[PDB]
Each structure stands twice: as structure tokens, then as C-alpha cells.
Amino acid sequence: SLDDQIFVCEKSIEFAKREKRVFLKHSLSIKLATLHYQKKQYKDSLALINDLLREFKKLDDKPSLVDVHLLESKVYHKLRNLAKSKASLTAARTAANSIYCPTQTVAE
Amino acid sequence: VPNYEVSEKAFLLTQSKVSIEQRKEAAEFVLAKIKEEEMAPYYKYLCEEYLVKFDQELYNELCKKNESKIKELNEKIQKLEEDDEGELEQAQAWINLGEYYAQIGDKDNAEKTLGKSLSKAISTGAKIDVMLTIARLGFFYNDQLYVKEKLEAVNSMIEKGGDWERRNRYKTYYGIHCLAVRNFKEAAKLLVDSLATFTSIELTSYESIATYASVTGLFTLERTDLKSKVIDSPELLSLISTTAALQSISSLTISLYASDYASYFPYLLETYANVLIPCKYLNRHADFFVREMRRKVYAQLLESYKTLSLKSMASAFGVSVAFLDNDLGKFIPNKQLNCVIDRVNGIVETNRPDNKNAQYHLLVKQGDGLLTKLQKYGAAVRLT
Amino acid sequence: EDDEFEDFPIDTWANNIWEENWDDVEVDDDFTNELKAELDRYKREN
């Protein structure tokens, strides 16, 4: 992986707002956020995800909710907190009942 | 409020051995918040303290606009005391008056304004929380008595009643006060439980008070209650690298609790430089801290040994013998440390009160020490 | 019951809230500075 894959999907946010789409600014924000755990640079997806925390449930984008609590939960779980990370997975569980996502996601 | 940060950066500029870079950027951070805070009782107060630059034109302007607004709020009031339903409200405009003295950082003035402002019928948050602010000026100027009296006031206001949600910010005040003096032993429980809930807008950032509760914690906590209440931190874990200290000081504490002796002194020096001396509250106490934090390790290192050889210790800590001997010599004769040294053989044996024998001798000595006293005063009261 | 003590003049001269232990005012300030030289001085040799 390289910084270039970060850049092209940031320009993907550029595209989604050239079309003015919050759906893919938020989904492309998952895409980025993952790109920003690729390096354990999640201090950056710390800010990007902590911005993205309301971006899905303003859309009520459910697979994207458990995408968060998965990713974010691993972010703070990697930050040496299992209290709020654990609380966040348990926030995905109820969601996981309220969403339907590829079984891989259930595996995580 | 006052925003505190100005004060900490000011102190930063005061201290000589802080890194000159932080001294600069601290300074222009200050000045930057002189401008927007239109604020002058500093500019002479601070410039005086630097003296312990000065441009009086700027000073004049700041004073002028200050005169403008203090004028305005005073006038608004003058409209309001005629206004009868504004009882609760005139007090509030006052709160903006003396509060404005806080933005203008003038002590006596906000003092009087809020003191009289207690008169009006008001909420507990006013007669109480406003006092908290009054003292918060105290925290600001580093007058610990001016605080002391007022935390007595609020103490009463609470002792009659009021919310525990106020009692918490209370205990944060009175705690960091306790730290502002040598008294850690109180700040231990006070601060360390202030982690459960904390009000930052009152004074300081959450990571600051983190560094405080962790420092006091390290300092007075027992080994099993260190692990309990600090090494295990629902909170400090949530912070860690968050600042330039908690990673250093925690990197110290773990090096203690886990018995890493080679590393202890380096992290000790670090924290001495990075956290202690910049803290406006701690810097005064800097030495009293480190002296203590030496002893503990020496203590903790011996406790498992009835004899051990110097070069073992010196090797561990990574200093030469002669300096190590020189250090222990500080603590030992004060009976703050239960060691004793044999230099002929370079050996160290530990006499501490565990085996019933020791707890016998020590008891004999203490007993006689009580007798001779008792007899002494005895004859005096006999003959009188 | 008042007398002037004119014989004992009060001394004429040519010109910390916490109670202290002495070692408080020992305050020899040495260790912070001496240490670093001791540490590095040591580990340069080993």
C-alpha cells in the first residue's frame, strides 16, 4: 500500500462532492478510514471517523454503522481502551441485528 | 474566565531552564491573548514579572476599550436596578460585570462585584459557583491563602446544601489547591477520584489534571494500590500519548511498578524536566518530589534482600558506586530508609522491623524515649 | 503590670505555608544536575 491510494480516494471525496453526494462522501469516508488504518495511521482516521460517527446515522446507513463500530472499535481498541471499544462493538451488535451485511462483517 | 493557558505560558516564560523554544511560542501565545483579551492588568503585572516588551501605547488602548465596556455594563446595571423583576437578573448583569473583571483579570474588582452580587436572590449555582470563580482568580494569581479563605466560604455553602455536581468541581479545586502546597496525601484521593468526573472549563485541560492525579498517585500510593487505582486506569489509558507528559511520567511509573531499574533514573530526569518544572503548581515542589522518588526505589529495591552488594545496585541503576553510596547517605541517617551500609566489603544489609526481634528493639527504644520525657515533665509538675 | 524594658532595646539593624522538615531547606539542588553527568559518564565507559 502507498499514500497514493489515500490520495485517490480523497479525490474520491472530491468527486462525491463534485456530484454533491453525502452518501458517498460518507461511504468514501469508510473507504478512506480503512485506508487510514492501513498504516496504523488511524490517528488520522481518528479525526476522520470521529467526524464520520454521525455521518452514517444522519443517513441511517446501517452497514456503514457496523462498518464504523467495527473499524472505530478496532481503532480505540488499538488505542488501549477496551471499555469504549467494547461498548462500540456492543453498539454494532444491536445495529447488526438492525442491519444486514456480508457474512464477513459478522465474522469480524 | 480567566482562560488559564495565558498563566501557564507566563510561568513558562518566567522559568530559566525551560526550553527556549517553548519559552518563545509560549510568550507569543500569551501576547496573542493579550490582544484579543484587550487585557492590561497583566501587561504591567506580567511585564513586572518578566522583570523579576513593555509598550505603554498598546497598554493605553487596552485600558481605553476596557473603560468603554466596564462603562457599558455599569450603565446597563443602572438601567436594571430600577427594573424590579430583574432581582435575579441585575445580579446576573453583575456576574457579567465582575466576570468582565475576570476577562480584565482585575482581582479586587471582580471580588467586590461578585461579593455584593451574592446579595440578590439567586440559585445555589450563583452563590456557590460564582464563589468558585472568585477563588479561581486565586488559582490564577497564585495566592493560595486568597483561595484558602474562599474554599472555606464555598465549604460552608456546600455544608448547608447544594448539588454534588457542584461538590465535584469543588473537590477538584480544593484538591489542586492541596497539590499547590506540599500536601499530596490529600491530593491523592481528591485528584485520583476527580478522574471519574471533571469540569475543564473551570480551570484546566483534562490531560493536565491527568498529569496531576498521576503524579500525586505515583507519589503517595502503595504498590498494590498503585496497580489498583492508577496502573489500571479506565481513564489514563484513554489518554496516554495525548500529551507530552503522561507518556513520560507513565513511562516512569511502569518502570517502577514493573521493576525496571536500569531505566528508572532516565525517565525520572525526563519527567523532572518535562512535567514537573513547567507546571506552575508543581515547579515549586520539584525537588521535594524527586528526593522522595529516589527513596522509594532504593526502598523498593532492598525490600526483598537482607543483604546485597553495592555494585549490584549501582550496576542496576547504572551509576558508579561512589555516587550511589553518596546518595543513600542522604536518607539513611534520617531513618527514612531501613538500610545500612558496609563500605569495607561494599555490601548493604537491611535492618527493617519485621522479625519479632527488630520489633522488640525498636519498641524498647521508643518506650524509653517516652519514659525519659514523661519523667522529665513529671518532676516539673511535681515541684510546681 | 507594664514596664518599659528600656534596658533591652529591640534589635537595631544595619540592613511556605507547609511546615518544613529541615531537609526541605537542605534544598541542595544537586541531584538533578549531578545525576545526568553520573549516568552518561558511566555508560560511556561500558
Short mmCIF file of N, CA, C and O in Angstrom, two decimals, chain C:
data_model
loop_
_atom_site.label_atom_id
_atom_site.label_comp_id
_atom_site.label_asym_id
_atom_site.label_seq_id
_atom_site.Cartn_x
_atom_site.Cartn_y
_atom_site.Cartn_z
N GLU C 1 0.64 46.25 85.32
CA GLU C 1 1.73 45.29 85.17
C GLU C 1 2.46 45.51 83.86
O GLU C 1 2.51 44.63 83.01
N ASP C 2 3.05 46.70 83.71
CA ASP C 2 3.73 47.07 82.48
C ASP C 2 5.01 47.81 82.83
O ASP C 2 4.99 48.78 83.59
N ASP C 3 6.13 47.35 82.27
CA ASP C 3 7.40 48.05 82.41
C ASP C 3 8.10 48.11 81.07
O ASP C 3 7.94 47.23 80.22
N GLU C 4 8.92 49.14 80.90
CA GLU C 4 9.36 49.56 79.58
C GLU C 4 10.45 48.69 78.98
O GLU C 4 10.61 48.70 77.76
N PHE C 5 11.20 47.96 79.80
CA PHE C 5 12.33 47.17 79.31
C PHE C 5 13.32 48.02 78.53
O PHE C 5 13.99 47.53 77.63
N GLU C 6 13.42 49.31 78.87
CA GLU C 6 14.32 50.19 78.14
C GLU C 6 15.74 49.65 78.13
O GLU C 6 16.53 50.01 77.25
N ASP C 7 16.06 48.79 79.09
CA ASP C 7 17.37 48.16 79.15
C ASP C 7 17.56 47.18 78.01
O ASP C 7 18.67 47.05 77.48
N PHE C 8 16.51 46.46 77.62
CA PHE C 8 16.64 45.62 76.45
C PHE C 8 16.08 46.37 75.26
O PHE C 8 14.85 46.41 75.08
N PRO C 9 16.91 46.94 74.40
CA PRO C 9 16.39 47.55 73.18
C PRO C 9 16.10 46.48 72.15
O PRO C 9 16.83 45.49 72.04
N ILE C 10 15.04 46.69 71.38
CA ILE C 10 14.74 45.77 70.30
C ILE C 10 15.77 45.95 69.20
O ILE C 10 16.17 47.08 68.88
N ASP C 11 16.22 44.84 68.62
CA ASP C 11 17.43 44.83 67.81
C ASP C 11 17.39 45.89 66.74
O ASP C 11 16.40 46.04 66.02
N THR C 12 18.48 46.64 66.64
CA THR C 12 18.65 47.63 65.59
C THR C 12 19.52 47.04 64.49
O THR C 12 20.46 46.28 64.77
N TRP C 13 19.20 47.38 63.25
CA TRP C 13 19.75 46.67 62.11
C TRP C 13 20.45 47.63 61.16
O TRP C 13 19.97 48.75 60.93
N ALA C 14 21.57 47.18 60.61
CA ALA C 14 22.30 47.91 59.58
C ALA C 14 21.78 47.61 58.18
O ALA C 14 22.36 48.12 57.20
N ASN C 15 20.74 46.79 58.05
CA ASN C 15 20.13 46.42 56.77
C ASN C 15 21.12 45.73 55.84
O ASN C 15 20.81 45.48 54.67
N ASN C 16 5.49 29.48 51.67
CA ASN C 16 5.99 28.45 52.57
C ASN C 16 4.94 28.06 53.59
O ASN C 16 5.24 27.91 54.77
N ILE C 17 3.70 27.91 53.13
CA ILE C 17 2.60 27.57 54.03
C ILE C 17 2.91 26.30 54.78
O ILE C 17 2.75 26.23 56.00
N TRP C 18 3.34 25.27 54.07
CA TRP C 18 3.62 23.98 54.69
C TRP C 18 4.74 24.11 55.71
O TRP C 18 5.77 24.73 55.44
N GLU C 19 4.54 23.52 56.88
CA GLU C 19 5.65 23.39 57.82
C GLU C 19 6.74 22.58 57.16
O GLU C 19 6.47 21.69 56.35
N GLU C 20 7.99 22.90 57.48
CA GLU C 20 9.12 22.29 56.80
C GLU C 20 9.84 21.31 57.70
O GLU C 20 10.02 21.56 58.90
N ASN C 21 10.26 20.19 57.13
CA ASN C 21 11.39 19.47 57.68
C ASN C 21 12.64 20.28 57.35
O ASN C 21 12.61 21.16 56.50
N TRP C 22 13.74 20.02 58.07
CA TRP C 22 14.96 20.73 57.69
C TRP C 22 15.32 20.36 56.27
O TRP C 22 15.44 21.25 55.42
N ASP C 23 15.41 19.07 55.98
CA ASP C 23 15.84 18.63 54.65
C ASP C 23 14.99 19.26 53.55
O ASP C 23 15.41 19.28 52.39
N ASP C 24 13.82 19.78 53.90
CA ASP C 24 13.15 20.70 53.00
C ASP C 24 14.08 21.84 52.65
O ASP C 24 14.32 22.12 51.47
N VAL C 25 14.64 22.50 53.67
CA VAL C 25 15.55 23.61 53.45
C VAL C 25 17.00 23.16 53.34
O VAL C 25 17.90 24.01 53.27
N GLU C 26 17.26 21.85 53.34
CA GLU C 26 18.50 21.36 52.77
C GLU C 26 18.64 21.86 51.35
O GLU C 26 19.60 22.55 51.00
N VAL C 27 17.65 21.53 50.51
CA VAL C 27 17.40 22.13 49.21
C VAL C 27 18.73 22.28 48.47
O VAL C 27 19.03 23.33 47.88
N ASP C 28 19.54 21.22 48.51
CA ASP C 28 20.88 21.33 47.96
C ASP C 28 20.90 21.30 46.44
O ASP C 28 21.94 21.60 45.85
N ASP C 29 19.79 20.93 45.80
CA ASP C 29 19.57 21.20 44.39
C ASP C 29 20.51 20.39 43.50
O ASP C 29 20.42 20.42 42.27
N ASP C 30 21.42 19.67 44.15
CA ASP C 30 22.49 19.00 43.43
C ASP C 30 21.95 17.95 42.47
O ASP C 30 22.29 17.95 41.28
N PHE C 31 21.10 17.06 42.98
CA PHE C 31 20.98 15.74 42.39
C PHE C 31 20.56 15.80 40.93
O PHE C 31 21.14 15.11 40.09
N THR C 32 19.55 16.60 40.63
CA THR C 32 19.08 16.70 39.25
C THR C 32 20.24 16.87 38.30
O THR C 32 20.35 16.18 37.28
N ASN C 33 21.15 17.78 38.63
CA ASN C 33 22.24 18.09 37.73
C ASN C 33 23.37 17.08 37.84
O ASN C 33 23.95 16.69 36.83
N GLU C 34 23.71 16.66 39.06
CA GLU C 34 24.83 15.74 39.20
C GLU C 34 24.53 14.41 38.52
O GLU C 34 25.41 13.80 37.90
N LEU C 35 23.29 13.97 38.63
CA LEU C 35 22.87 12.68 38.11
C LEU C 35 23.28 12.53 36.66
O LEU C 35 24.13 11.70 36.35
N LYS C 36 22.71 13.36 35.78
CA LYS C 36 22.91 13.19 34.35
C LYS C 36 24.37 12.94 34.02
O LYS C 36 24.71 12.00 33.30
N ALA C 37 25.27 13.75 34.60
CA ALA C 37 26.68 13.53 34.39
C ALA C 37 27.10 12.18 34.94
O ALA C 37 28.00 11.54 34.39
N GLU C 38 26.46 11.73 36.01
CA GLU C 38 26.84 10.42 36.54
C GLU C 38 26.39 9.30 35.61
O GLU C 38 27.19 8.42 35.27
N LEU C 39 25.13 9.32 35.20
CA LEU C 39 24.62 8.33 34.27
C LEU C 39 25.50 8.26 33.04
O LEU C 39 26.18 7.25 32.81
N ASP C 40 25.49 9.33 32.24
CA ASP C 40 26.19 9.25 30.96
C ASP C 40 27.67 8.97 31.17
O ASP C 40 28.25 8.14 30.48
N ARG C 41 28.28 9.65 32.15
CA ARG C 41 29.68 9.37 32.46
C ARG C 41 29.90 7.89 32.63
O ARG C 41 30.90 7.34 32.14
N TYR C 42 28.99 7.22 33.32
CA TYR C 42 29.10 5.78 33.48
C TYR C 42 28.99 5.08 32.14
O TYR C 42 29.91 4.39 31.71
N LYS C 43 27.87 5.29 31.43
CA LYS C 43 27.62 4.41 30.30
C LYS C 43 28.52 4.70 29.11
O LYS C 43 28.52 3.92 28.16
N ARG C 44 29.28 5.80 29.14
CA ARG C 44 30.32 5.97 28.13
C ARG C 44 31.45 4.98 28.34
O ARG C 44 32.19 4.69 27.40
N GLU C 45 31.59 4.46 29.55
CA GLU C 45 32.70 3.61 29.91
C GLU C 45 32.34 2.14 29.83
O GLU C 45 33.18 1.29 30.15
N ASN C 46 31.12 1.81 29.43
CA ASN C 46 30.67 0.44 29.48
C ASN C 46 29.67 0.16 28.36
O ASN C 46 28.47 0.03 28.62
#
